[PDB]
Write a protein that binds this ligand. Structure first.
Ligand code: ZN
Ligand code: ZN
Lengths: 496, 590, 633
C-alpha cells in the first residue's frame, strides 16, 4: 500500500535530483515498513535503480540498509543485492553503499554459513577494488564474517598496501577476527614488527594493540612477550599523546614478563642517595605532557605490581615522590595505587614523606584517601608508629571534622600489628610511676583517639592490662558502650 | 648543496649566530652577543657574510629563536649600525620580551663599560619596528620559494625550533630547547620532518639530568625545614625564566600546605615579567592553559613585591632575588646583610661564572670577596636545557640524515659526536667558529603526469604479477617550465606526429609432402599446441592469428617441395613474431 | 568532484565536498531560527505565560489545545525549544574523513554529527574558535537545562495537520528531523575529538590533499579554508569581513588563482551601515537612560559585544553618564571576558601593539577595573543584592526564546520608558518579539553586521577571478524585501551556479594531472633529445614506488614514430657495408632491393614493409639499422 504509493509517486515525479531526493528523505525520515512489505518495497526500489545519477541509487541502498535492521528480509534481499553488485560497478560511492548494505544484511540476522556468510564473503573478496573504492569496507566485511575455526593470507598482503586508512581497516578487521578467537598465527608478530614503525598516525595506534594481543597468546619467539614488551617500551615515547595512552594501558594489562627485564624499565639517583643516607620506559612515562598519560601509567604500574610479588619495593619511591603532581586526579590515583599494592611493603624511612601530605588545605578527598592508605599500610619500626601517631594528632587538632575517620584508621593501625605499640604504652598515656595521674577528660577527641589504638591492639597481647592505669578501665567500659564498632570486647576484669 | 658557517658558538657558547647557504639562499639564524669579551669580539663577525657592503644584498632573512641575550642581543647592533632592512622573524612572546632585556643590557653597558659605539634606545625602537611575527606551526613565505616554520620548544616562554625548507631540501635549527617538561612550559615537540641537516645544542650533552620531580621534591623539603627553623631563605635567580618556575612551584606547594609566612619577589623586572607571563597564556602548557578558566595562575595570591627595608625584618622569610650571577648582586646585598647568621639558607640553582664572586661562593671557603660567609649554601641544578637523553630522543624522533652541534664545549661536543655516530649511524660535524662545512643535497626534480596512465599501471601492479618488471614507460615532454610525463599515444596525439607502423613479413619455407590446403590448419594446430596461453585462432579465410601475428599460406610457389608461409607482424609484437618464425623454421610436425 | 549541500541556511552551511580519494565536510550549522516557533522558557513561571489561551483545531478531532497556544492572534507550539539539523541521510557521514570548522557560530551543531553518526574522522579548528565554541555550547546547555520543561508536543508535527496549521507554522522545514538539545557528556566528547590548528598551518591529509586556514576577520579566529592538491584549488569562504575590525585582517592574496570558489555567509542586512547604526545604538541608549528607564540588550557573550563595548566606553564620557552602571549577566560572562583578553596574537595590529606595550588589548578590562561594568554569573545570587536603576543590562541569548532576557523582559515589558535594543542580526526581531506582544517597552532595531556586502563581493570576485563560483540560491535570487533592487543579488561571470537545501552538485572540473617525483639517479641517467624547437623529450623506463598516496620512480614498451628516408637508408647501407642495392620509385613509395638475402623493402607514407628470406643475423641487422632512423616513443 504505502510502498506502492511511494513507488508510483517517485515514478510519476521522475525528477532527477529533486523527486528522488525528496522521496528518499521522506521515506527514511517518516518510518520503517514494520511488516513483510519490506521485500516488495526492495523489489520496487531495485526496479527504479536502473537509472542515472548514482546518487539516487546510493540513497536507495542506504534506505535498504536501514530497512534491513527490521530482520524481516533474509535470502531474497541477499540474492538481489548479490545480483545488483555483480554488475553495478560504477564509481566508488555505489560500490560503497552496496558493500555497506551487504554487511548490514550479513550481521543483521543470518550469522550462518551456506551462502549466509560464505558466499557474501567470497563475493566481496573477489570484488577487491583498485583505488580505495571499498577496500576498507570489504576488509571490515570479511572481518565481521568469520569464516570458521580452521583467510589471514589476504590481510597479510594487505597490511603493506597503499593507503594508511586501508591499513587501519585491516587492523580493525584483525581485531574483529581475534575477538572471536580464530587462533591467530605467530607470523603476524613478525609482520607487525614493521607495522610498529609505520611513520603515520592512526596506524601505530592499533598496531600496538595487535602486537599486544598476539604476544599475550604465547611467549615463544627465540623471548616473545619480553620482546613485545620491549617494543612497547621503546614506543612509549611516541611523538603524539594519543598513542601513549594505549601504550600504557596495554603493557599494564599484560601480566607475565621476565623479572630481570622488568626492572630495566625503572632503572635510571637522589632516591638511592636518601636510602644510603638513612642506612627506561616508566622512568619517563611517569612524567609526561598531560595528566591522561600519567593516569594510564599509574594504572599500568599498579596492575603489574599486583601481578609480580617482587618489583613492588622498587616502585614505592616512584609512587610516593609523585604526590605533589598538582592534578587532583593524579593525586587520588597515586593514593589508590599505593593502597592497592600495600602488602609485604615496608616504609623504613618513607613514613615521614607519605605522612607530610596529610596536611592539605581541605582536600577532604585527599586526606580521607591518606587515612585509607594508612589503615592498610605496613610499618616495622616502633618509632614509625610513634611518628604516625604524632602526625595524626596534629591532623586531628588542625582539622576537627574527620576525627570519625581518624579513629577508624587508628583502629586498623593497631589491629594490624599490635606488638609494635606495647613499648609505647607507658609513654603515650601519662602513667607517672608513683603519682596518681589526674583523670584526663573522657570525651576529648585526642585521648579517645589514643585509647582506641591501645584497646584494639590489646585483643592480641594478653599482658598489658597490667600497664593500664586506674582510669583506663572505666574509660574502656565507657568507650565499649559508646563506640561499639571501634573497640572489641576484651578480657578486662571490670567488664567480664 | 648545503653550506653552514657558524659565526659563533662553534665548539663554544654565547653570541650564537649561524649562516645557512641553501639552494642559493642565505639565511641568518640567531644573532646575539656574549659577556666576557668587552671588545667588539663579543658581537658576531660580519666581514665574512658581506665583508664591507650592503647586507640585504646577500642576506635573505633573519631568524631569532628566543629572547635570551646570548641569542637576541645583537639585533640592534646587526640591524642599525651595520644597516639591514630585511625581514626579521621571531615569535610574538620573543618580540614582546626581547626589547626590555635589550634596553636593560644597553643601560648596563652604559653604566659599566660605556662603549662609545653602542646602540641607543631610539635605535632599538627602530630595529624592533622592523620585526615580523610567527605563531606556532605557521608557515611564513619569506619569498616565492623559501618558507619558515616554527615549533614549540620551551627553553623559555616562546622559544621555538625552526624548519627552514626549500623545495625538498630542509634544515631544522633547534637552538636552545628542553625535552623535559617543566612546571609551566611544555616539552618541545616536532613532526617527523626527516630533514637533511639538523643544528642542535649540546649545553648538557654529557650530563643525563636526573628525575626533575625528585630534584624539586628535595628543594621543597629543604625550603620547608628552613622556614621551620626560623631562618630566612634567599634564592638568587635572574629575573626571567627560572624565577617564574620557582615562583609557580613554591606558590602551589604553599597554597596546599596553607603556610602563611609572607614571601617576597625582587622588584624591577617583576612588573614586566608577570604581565607578559599573564598576557601570553597560550604558550604555558596544559596545566596552566586549562586551569586558566577559573583562576589565572600568574595572578599570585601570596607573592608580593619585595621591599629593601624588609631585609632586617625578623621571623623566617622567603625572598627571591636577582641576579643569578651575583656579579652586581642586589641579592648580594641581602647576602652580605645576613652572611654572619648560620640559620639562613641560600640556593644556587645554576652554574656560576668561573673566576667571579659566583665561583668564590661556589667554592666552600669562608673568606669570599675579605668577608667570611657562614650561612649554608646548596648548589642545586634547575637548568632548562637539553640532557643527553633529550638530544638523542629528539634526533631519533626527527629522524634526520646529518647533525651539527653548537652551543657548548668542544670535549662534550666530541663525546656526543662519538656516541651519536656509534648509535644512529648518522653523519656529524663540529664546526669551529668561522669554519664553513659543505654537505651534498638530493635535489630530485618534480614532474607532472597524466592520471589514466598511472591508474592502469597501478591496476596492473595490483594484479598478482608483481616482482616482474613491468617497465613503467612513456616520455617526458619538456617546456623548461612544466615537465610532464605522458604515455606514448597521448604524446603522439599531443604533438601531432604520425603513428608510424612497422610491419615485418617473413616467408617461412616448409619442406614436406603434406598438402598446401592443410598447411594452414597444421600451422594453427601446432601453434595452439606449442604457445600455451596464447590467443591462437583459425580465421574463416584459412589464415591463423597468434595474438597480433598473422600466418597466411601464400600462393603455391614454383618449387613443388617448398610451401611459403607469410608470417606478418608489427614491431610491438615483433618478439612473438620472431619466436614464431624461429619455431616454424624447425618445420611443422610430420 | 561532488559537492553536497545539506543545509539551506544561507549563513550556517554544511557542505560535504569530495576530492581525490577523500571526503571532507565543512561546518556544522545549527539553524537556531527554528527555535523561534516555541514559547519562552521562563526562569520563574509567570501568570501570563501560564494562562495563555489554547488554539483549537477547527475540526476538533485532534486534541491540539494542549500542544498549541495563541497570543496576539498568533500561534506557537508549546514544549521545550527545539533545533533544526543538517540532513545527515544524503550520504553516510561515517564515510566522511575530515571535518573543518569556520567559526564558533558554524560549529555550534558539532556534537550531533560528531557523536551520534559514528563519525570516526578528525576535526580541525582554530584555538579561539574551539574555546569560544565550548563557551557557547555550555551557555546553550545551561539555558535549556535549569528548568526542564518536559512537555513534548508531537501531534502537531504531522504533515497533514501542519498543512492546515496557520503561518508561520506552515513555513517550517524538515519538521520531522528536529531533535532535542544535546547534553554535557556529548559536548565533552565532541570537544575532545577536536585537534587544533594555527593560521596558515599547512595540514596534509595522507598526501592526498593539503588544507590551510586563512584569517577571515569576521570574528576572533574565524577561518576561510583552502583545499589544494598540487594542481587544483578549492577556496571555501564562509563569513569574511574586510571592514576595519579587531580580528586579524582578511588576507585576499592567497585566495586568487582558485579553480572552485564556494562562497557563503554574506551579510544579512545588506542596506545596514555598521558605523551609522552603531551611532544610532549609542544615541538611543543615551536618550533612554536620560529619560530614566532601563535598557536591555540581547547579544551573544562574544563577538559583536566587544566592539559595542569599545564604542560605549568611548561614548559614555561624552554625556557623562558615569552614574548608570553596566551589568553583563551570563553564565559565561567572566570566562568570555578573560578569554578575549588572553588572545593577543589573533587580534588586529593595533591591539597586538597595545600588547607589546604591556597593557590588556581590549578596554573592557579597564572598564571592569574602573567598576562601571560588572559581570555576573546569573540574575540569582549577588546580582539581586547589587542591582540598581536606571541601568543597561547585557543579557545572554538573542533568540529571545530563553535565558535571562526572557525574565528581564517579562519584568520590564509593562512599562514604556524601558527599551530593548537589538543588535545581533541573525533573527527576525518581529518573530522574536511576537510572543511578548503587546508590549509597552519601546522596541528599537539597530542590527549590527560586519560581513562583506554585495559591492565588496563583486570587488573580491573581480580581484580573484575564479574559474567557478558556487553560492546559495538566496543570493542569486534577489531578496524578497526589494525585488526591484538589482544590487542585492550576486553577479559573476560565468554565472554562479546555485543550490538549495539537500542538493547534490558536480563541479565542472576534470582530473588531468597530478604530482609525482623523479629520483636523482634516474634523472641523471636520462638523456634528453629534441625533435622540435624548444621541445626535448626522452623515453622513460623505471619502476614506481607509492607511499602515502605519494609516487616516486627509480631505475629497475616504447614504439616507433617517424618515416625513414630511402635515400638515407641506401646511403647508410652503402657506407656500412651493404652493396648492390637498387631503388625504384612508385606512386608514393620506394621499393629498395638488397641482393644479399634478397631483401625487398617498400617505404610509403607512414608505412614500411620488409620482406626477406629465412634469415636471422641479417634480419636483426636490418632491424637495428631501420629502427635507428626515427624517434622512439
Ligand atoms: Zn638560551
Ligand atoms: Zn643560550
Amino acid at each position: 500500500p504505502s510502498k506502492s504509493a511511494a513507488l508510483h509517486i517517485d515514478l510519476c515525479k521522475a525528477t532527477s535530483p529533486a523527486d528522488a531526493l525528496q522521496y528518499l528523505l521522506q521515506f527514511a525520515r517518516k518510518p520503517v515498513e514494520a511488516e513483510s512489505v519490506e521485500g516488495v518495497v526492495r523489489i520496487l526500489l531495485e526496479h527504479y535503480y536502473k537509472e542515472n545519477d548514482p546518487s539516487v541509487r546510493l540513497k536507495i541502498a542506504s534506505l535498504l540498509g536501514l530497512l534491513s535492521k527490521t530482520a524481516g528480509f533474509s535470502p531474497d534481499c541477499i540474492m538481489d543485492d548479490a545480483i545488483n553488485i555483480l554488475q553495478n560497478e560504477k564509481s566508488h560511492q555505489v560500490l560503497a553503499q552496496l558493500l555497506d548494505t551487504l554487511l548490514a544484511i550479513g550481521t543483521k540476522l543470518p550469522e550462518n554459513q551456506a551462502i549466509q556468510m560464505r558466499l557474501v564473503d567470497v563475493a566481496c573478496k573477489h570484488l577487491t577494488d583498485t583505488s580505495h573504492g571499498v577496500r576498507n569496507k570489504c576488509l571490515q566485511l570479511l572481518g565481521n564474517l568469520g569464516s570458521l575455526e580452521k583467510v589471514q593470507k589476504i590481510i597479510g598482503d594487505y597490511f603493506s598496501d597503499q593507503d594508511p586508512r586501508v591499513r587501519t581497516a585491516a587492523i580493525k578487521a584483525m581485531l574483529q577476527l581475534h575477538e572471536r578467537g580464530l587462533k591467530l598465527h605467530q607470523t603476524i608478530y613478525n609482520q607487525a614488527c614493521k607495522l610498529l614503525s609505520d611513520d603515520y598516525e592512526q596506524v601505530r595506534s592499533a598496531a600496538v594493540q595487535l602486537i599486544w594481543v598476539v604476544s599475550q597468546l604465547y611467549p615463544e619467539s627465540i623471548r616473545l612477550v619480553d620482546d613485545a614488551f620491549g617494543k612497547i617500551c621503546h614506543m612509549v615515547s611516541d611523538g603524539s599523546w594519543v598513542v601513549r595512552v594505549q601504550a600504557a594501558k596495554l603493557l599494564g594489562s599484560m601480566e607475565q614478563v621476565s623479572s630481570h627485564f622488568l626492572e630495566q624499565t625503572l632503572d635510571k639517583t637522589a632516591h638511592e642517595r636518601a636510602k644510603e643516607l638513612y642506612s627506561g620506559a616508566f622512568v619517563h612515562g611517569l612524567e609526561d605532557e598531560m595528566y591522561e598519560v600519567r593516569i594510564a601509567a599509574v594504572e599500568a604500574l599498579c596492575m603489574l605490581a599486583q601481578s609480580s610479588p617482587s618489583f613492588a619495593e622498587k616502585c614505592l619511591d616512584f609512587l610516593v615522590d609523585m604526590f605533589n603532581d598538582e592534578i587532583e586526579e593524579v593525586r587520588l590515583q597515586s593514593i589508590h595505587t599505593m593502597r592497592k599494592i600495600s602488602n609485604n611493603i615496608t616504609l623504613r624511612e618513607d613514613q615521614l614523606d607519605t605522612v607530610l601530605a596529610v596536611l592539605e588545605d581541605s582536600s577532604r578527598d585527599i586526606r580521607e584517601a591518606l587515612h585509607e592508605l594508612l589503615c592498610c599500610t605496613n610499618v616495622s619500626t616502633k618509632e614509625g608508629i610513634h611518628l604516625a601517631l604524632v602526625e595524626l594528632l596534629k591532623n586531628l587538632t588542625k582539622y576537627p571534622t574527620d576525627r570519625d575517620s581518624i579513629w577508624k584508621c587508628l583502629k586498623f593501625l593497631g589491629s594490624r600489628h599490635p606488638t609494635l605499640v606495647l613499648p609505647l604504652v607507658p609513654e603515650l598515656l601519662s602513667t607517672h610511676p608513683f603519682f596518681d595521674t589526674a583523670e584526663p577528660d573522657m570525651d576529648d577527641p585526642a585521648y579517645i583517639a589514643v585509647l582506641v589504638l591501645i584497646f584494639n591492639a590489646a585483643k592480641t597481647c594478653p599482658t598489658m592490662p597490667a600497664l593500664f592505669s586506674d582510669h583506663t578501665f572505666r574509660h574502656y567500659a565507657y568507650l565499649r558502650d559508646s563506640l561499639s564498632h571501634l573497640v572489641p570486647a576484651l578480657r578486662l576484669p571490670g567488664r567480664k | 648543496e648545503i653550506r653552514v658557517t657558524p659565526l659563533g658558538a662553534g665548539q663554544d657558547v654565547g653570541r650564537s649566530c649561524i649562516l645557512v647557504s641553501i639552494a642559493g639562499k642565505n639565511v641568518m639564524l640567531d644573532c646575539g652577543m656574549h659577556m666576557g669579551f668587552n671588545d667588539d669580539r663579543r658581537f658576531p663577525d660580519f666581514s665574512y657574510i658581506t665583508q664591507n657592503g650592503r647586507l640585504t644584498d646577500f642576506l635573505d632573512c633573519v631568524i631569532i629563536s628566543h629572547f635570551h641575550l646570548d641569542h637576541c642581543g645583537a639585533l640592534p647592533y646587526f640591524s642599525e649600525m651595520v644597516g639591514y632592512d630585511g625581514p626579521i622573524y621571531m615569535t610574538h612572546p620573543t618580540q614582546a620580551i626581547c626589547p626590555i632585556l635589550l634596553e636593560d643590557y644597553r643601560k648596563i653597558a652604559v653604566d659599566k663599560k660605556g662603549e662609545a659605539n653602542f646602540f641607543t634606545s631610539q635605535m632599538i625602537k627602530d630595529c624592533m619596528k622592523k620585526v615580523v611575527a610567527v605563531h606556532l606551526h605557521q608557515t611564513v613565505q619569506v619569498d616565492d620559494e623559501l618558507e619558515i616554520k616554527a615549533y614549540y620548544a620551551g627553553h623559555v616562554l616562546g622559544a621555538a625550533m625552526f624548519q627552514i625548507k626549500v623545495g625538498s631540501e630542509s634544515v631544522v635549527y633547534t637552538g636552545d630547547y628542553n625535552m623535559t617538561p617543566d612546571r609551566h612550559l611544555g616539552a618541545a615537540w616536532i613532526d617527523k620532518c626527516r630533514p637533511n641537516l639538523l643544528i642542535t645544542e649540546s649545553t648538557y650533552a654529557t650530563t643525563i639530568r636526573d628525575s626533575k620531580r625528585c630534584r624539586e621534591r628535595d628543594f621543597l623539603k629543604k625550603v620547608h625545614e628552613t622556614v621551620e627553623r626560623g631562618g630566612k631563605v634567599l634564592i638568587p635567580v635572574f629575573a626571567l625564566g627560572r624565577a617564574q618556575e620557582l615562583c609557580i612551584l613554591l606558590e602551589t606547594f604553599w597554597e596546599r600546605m596553607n603556610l602563611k609566612v609572607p614571601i617576597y619577589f625582587s622588584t624591577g623586572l617583576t612588573e614586566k615579567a608577570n604581565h607578559y607571563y599573564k598576557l601570553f597564556i597560550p604558550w604555558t602548557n596544559q596545566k596552566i592553559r586549562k586551569t586558566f578558566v577559573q583562576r589565572n595562575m600568574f595572578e599570585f595570591k601570596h607573592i608580593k613585591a619585595f621591599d629593601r627595608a624588609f631585609a632586617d625584618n625578623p621571623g623566617p622569610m622567603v625572598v627571591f632575588a636577582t641576579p643569578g650571577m651575583l656579579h652586581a648582586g642586589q641579592s648580594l646585598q641581602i647576602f652580605r646583610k645576613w652572611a654572619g647568621n648560620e640559620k639562613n639558607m641560600v640556593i644556587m640553582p645554576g652554574y656560576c661564572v668561573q673566576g667571579t664572586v659566583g665561583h668564590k661562593i661556589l667554592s666552600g671557603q669562608r673568606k669570599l670577596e675579605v668577608l667570611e660567609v657562614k650561612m649554608q649554601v646548596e648548589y642545586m641544578s634547575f637548568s632548562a636545557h637539553a640532557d643527553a637523553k633529550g638530544i638523542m630522543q629528539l634526533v631519533g624522533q626527527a629522524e634526520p640524515e646529518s647533525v651539527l652541534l653548537v652551543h657548548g664545549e668542544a670535549k662534550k661536543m666530541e663525546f656526543l659526536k662519538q656516541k651519536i655516530e656509534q648509535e644512529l649511524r648518522v653523519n656529524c660535524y663540529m664546526p669551529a667558529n668561522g669554519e664553513t662545512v659543505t654537505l651534498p643535497t638530493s635535489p630530485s626534480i618534480p614532474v607532472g603526469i597524466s592520471l589514466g596512465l598511472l591508474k592502469r599501471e597501478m591496476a596492473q601492479g595490483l594484479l598478482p604479477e608483481a616482482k616482474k618488471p613491468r617497465l613503467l614507460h612513456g616520455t617526458l615532454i619538456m617546456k623548461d617550465s612544466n615537465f610532464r610525463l605522458v604515455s606514448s599515444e597521448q604524446a603522439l596525439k599531443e604533438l601531432g606526429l604520425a603513428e608510424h607502423q612497422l610491419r615485418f613479413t617473413c616467408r617461412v619455407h616448409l619442406h614436406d609432402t603434406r598438402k598446401e590446403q592443410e598447411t594452414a590448419l597444421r600451422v594453427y594446430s601446432h601453434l595452439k599446441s606449442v604457445l600455451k596461453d596464447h590467443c591462437v585462432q583459425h580465421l574463416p579465410d584459412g589464415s591463423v592469428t597468434v595474438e597480433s601475428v598473422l600466418l597466411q599460406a601464400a600462393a603455391p610457389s614454383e618449387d613443388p617441395g617448398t610451401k611459403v608461409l607469410l608470417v606478418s607482424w608489427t614491431y610491438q609484437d615483433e618478439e612473438l613474431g620472431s619466436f614464431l618464425t624461429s619455431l616454424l623454421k624447425k618445420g611443422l610436425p610430420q | 568532484m561532488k559537492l553536497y549541500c545539506l543545509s539551506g541556511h544561507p549563513t550556517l552551511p554544511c557542505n560535504v565536498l569530495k576530492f581525490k580519494s577523500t571526503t571532507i565536510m565543512l561546518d556544522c550549522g545549527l539553524d537556531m531560527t527554528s527555535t523561534l516557533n516555541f514559547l519562552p522558557l521562563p526562569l520563574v513561571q509567570s501568570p501570563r505565560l501560564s494562562n495563555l489561551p489554547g488554539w483549537s483545531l477547527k475540526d476538533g478531532n485532534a486534541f491540539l489545545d494542549k500542544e498549541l497556544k495563541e497570543c496576539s492572534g498568533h500561534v506557537f507550539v508549546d514544549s521545550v525549544p527545539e533545533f533544526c539539523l543538517p540532513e545527515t541521510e544524503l550520504i553516510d557521514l561515517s564515510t566522511v574523513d575530515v571535518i573543518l570548522i569556520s567559526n564558533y557560530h558554524c560549529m555550534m551543531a558539532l556534537p550531533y554529527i560528531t557523536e551520534h553518526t559514528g563519525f570516526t574522522g578528525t576535526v580541525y579548528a582554530t584555538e579561539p574558535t574551539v574555546q569560544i565554541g565550548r563557551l557557547l555550547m555550555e551557555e546553550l546547555v545551561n539555558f535549556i537545562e535549569r528548568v526542564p520543561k518536559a512537555q513534548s508536543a508531537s501531534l502537531w508535527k504531522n504533515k497533514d495537520i501542519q498543512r492546515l496549521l496557520p503561518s508561520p507554522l506552515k513555513d517550517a522545514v524538515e519538521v520531522s528531523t528536529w531533535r532535542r538539545c544535546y547534553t554535557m557528556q556529548e559536548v565533552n566528547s565532541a570537544l575532545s575529538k577536536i585537534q587544533l590548528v594555527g593560521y596558515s598551518q599547512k595540514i596534509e591529509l595522507f598526501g592526498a590533499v593539503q588544507v590551510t586556514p586563512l584569517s577571515s576577520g569576521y570574528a576572533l579566529g574565524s577561518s576561510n579554508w583552502i583545499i589544494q592538491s598540487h594542481y587544483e584549488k578549492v577556496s571555501y569562504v564562509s563569513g569574511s569581513s574586510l571592514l576595519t575590525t579587531h580580528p586579524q585582517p582578511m588576507d585576499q592574496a592567497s585566495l586568487k588563482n582558485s579553480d572552485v570558489l564556494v562562497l557563503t555567509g554574506l551579510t544579512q542586512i545588506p542596506t545596514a551601515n555598521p558605523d551609522g547604526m552603531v551611532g544610532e545604538f549609542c544615541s538611543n541608549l543615551a536618550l533612554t537612560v536620560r529619560n530614566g528607564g532601563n535598557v536591555l540588550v540581547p547579544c551573544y557573550p562574544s563577538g559583536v559585544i566587544y566592539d559595542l563595548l569599545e564604542c560605549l566606553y568611548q561614548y559614555i564620557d561624552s554625556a557623562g553618564l558615569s552614574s548608570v552602571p553596566l551589568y553583563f549577566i551570563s553564565p559565561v560572562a567572566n570566562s568570555s571576558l578573560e578569554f578575549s583578553q588572553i588572545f593577543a596574537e589573533w587580534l588586529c595590529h593595533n591591539k597586538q601593539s597595545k600588547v607589546y606595550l604591556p597593557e590588556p588589548p581590549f578596554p573592557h578590562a579597564e572598564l571592569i577595573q574602573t567598576n562601571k561594568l560588572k559581570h555576573y554569573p546569573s540574575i540569582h545570587g549577588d546580582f539581586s543584592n547589587d542591582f540598581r536603576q536606571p541601568c543597561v543590562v547585557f543579557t545572554g541569548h538573542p533568540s529571545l526564546r530563553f535565558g535571562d532576557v526572557v525574565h528581564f523582559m517579562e519584568l520590564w515589558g509593562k512599562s514604556s520608558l524601558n527599551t530593548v535594543i537589538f543588535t545581533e542580526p541573525d533573527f527576525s526581531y518581529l518573530e522574536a518579539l511576537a510572543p511578548y506582544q503587546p508590549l509597552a517597552m519601546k522596541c528599537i532595531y539597530c542590527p549590527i553586521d560586519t560581513r562583506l556586502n554585495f559591492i565588496q563581493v563583486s570587488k573580491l570576485l573581480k580581484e580573484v577571478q575564479p574559474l567557478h563560483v558556487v553560492c546559495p540560491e538566496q543570493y542569486t535570487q534577489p531578496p524578497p524585501a526589494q525585488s526591484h533592487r538589482m544590487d542585492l543579488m550576486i553577479d559573476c561571470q560565468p554565472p554562479a551556479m546555485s543550490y538549495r537545501r539537500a542538493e547534490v552538485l558536480a563541479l565542472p572540473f576534470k582530473r588531468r594531472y597530478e604530482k609525482i617525483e623523479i629520483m636523482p639517479e634516474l634523472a641523471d641517467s636520462l638523456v634528453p633529445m629534441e625533435i622540435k624547437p624548444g621541445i626535448s623529450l626522452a623515453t622513460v623506463s623505471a619502476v614506481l614506488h607509492t607511499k602515502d598516496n605519494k609516487h616516486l620512480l627509480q631505475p629497475p614498451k616504447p614504439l616507433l614514430s617517424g618515416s625513414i628516408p630511402v635515400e638515407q637508408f641506401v646511403q647508410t647501407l652503402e657506407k656500412h657495408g651493404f652493396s648492390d642495392i637498387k631503388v625504384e620509385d612508385t606512386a608514393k613509395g620506394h621499393i629498395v632491393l638488397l641482393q644479399e638475402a634478397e631483401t625487398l623493402i617498400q617505404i610509403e607514407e607512414d608505412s614500411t614493409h620488409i620482406i626477406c628470406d629465412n634469415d636471422e643475423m641479417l634480419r636483426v641487422r636490418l632491424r637495428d639499422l631501420v629502427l635507428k632512423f626515427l624517434q622512439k616513443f
